[PDB]
């Protein structure tokens, strides 16, 4: 479940990455419906994923990204986590800010 998205899409996206090392963030964002959301709505999702309200999604929040969609979902592997970070971190600061998050989703 994730507010604004359809539960069945979220559940399908989680099933599609059930195997370790099968997560592909851009595929997940399409399947769960975020790639089809407005920029406004994508921004709302960022602030939720930023669990500590620091203004950035840090690596630990990427590792636990799926928990925002189901608390019992798996952690991303270290490989998946670092791949997610490298793809999104366009300014190189080691974190994902709101504009970087939207850019990955609305590409």
Binder of Ca ion out of 7, 21, 52, 78 (CB under 5 A): 52
* Residue of the chain from 9, 41, 58, 87 that contacts ligand [N+] (CB under 6 A): 58
Closest among 72, 11, 2, 81 to 42, alpha carbons compared: 2
Does residue 56 have a known ligand-binding role?
yes
Neighbours of 96 (CB within 10 A): 26
CA distance 30 to 76: 18
The answer to the question of residue 91 lying near ligand [N+] (CB under 6 A) is no
Cα atoms in the Cβ-side hemisphere of radius 13 Å centred on 64: 13
89 binds, among Ca ion, ligand [N+], none (CB under 5 to 8 A by kind): Ca ion
Binding site for ligand [N+] (CB under 6 A): 52, 58, 60-61
């Amino acid at each position: 479940s994730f507010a604004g998205l359809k539960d069945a899409d979220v559940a399908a996206a989680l099933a599609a990455c059930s195997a370790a090392d099968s997560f592909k963030h851009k595929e997940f964002f399409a399947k769960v419906g975020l790639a089809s959301k407005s920029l406004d709505d994508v921004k709302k999702a960022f602030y939720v994923i930023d669990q500590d309200k620091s203004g950035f999604i840090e690596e630990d929040e990427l590792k636990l990204f799926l928990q925002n969609f189901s608390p019992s979902a798996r952690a991303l592997t270290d490989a998946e986590t670092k791949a997610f970070l490298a793809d999104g971190d366009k300014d190189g600061d080691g974190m994902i800010g709101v504009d970087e998050f939207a850019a990955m989703i609305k590409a």
